[PDB]
Amino acid sequence: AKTAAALHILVKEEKLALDLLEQIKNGADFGKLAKKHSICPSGKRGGDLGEFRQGQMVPAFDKVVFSCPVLEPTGPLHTQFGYHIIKVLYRN
């Protein structure tokens, strides 16, 4: 699929990623957790890029959106920036 709706959180240290994964299970809040933790110039937008082509931001994203099914929070994944957790939506 060319364009998909995707939310991404990048964690610098694994310990926080584990706390997030458990934190999302205990609480559950992919959008709000991404915005607070990302604290980056793409926290507002990278935490909610809306729909964009499979080749805009990070290649690793194309793999999992083509690996996991949409509507399937997959991650946290491994990427150079740190841990990538990707939520897939619409996929079109």
Side-chain angles (χ1 to χ4, degrees), residues 33-81:
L33 286 169
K35 181 177 180 66
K36 190 181 182 297
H37 290 176
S38 187
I39 189 167
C40 74
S42 21
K44 290 180 180 84
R45 158 66 173 280
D48 191 340
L49 291 151
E51 256 164 350
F52 53 67
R53 297 171 170 162
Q54 70 180 45
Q56 316 261 268
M57 180 161 288
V58 64
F61 180 78
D62 180 344
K63 180 180 184 287
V64 51
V65 79
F66 206 105
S67 200
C68 68
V70 55
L71 290 111
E72 193 101 80
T74 300
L77 296 173
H78 172 257
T79 183
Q80 176 180 72
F81 290 90

Side-chain angles (χ1 to χ4, degrees), residues 13-24:
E13 61 180 345
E14 283 177 350
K15 181 189 281 101
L16 193 154
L18 162 53
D19 180 340
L20 138 140
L21 273 117
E22 181 179 357
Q23 180 175 350
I24 293 166

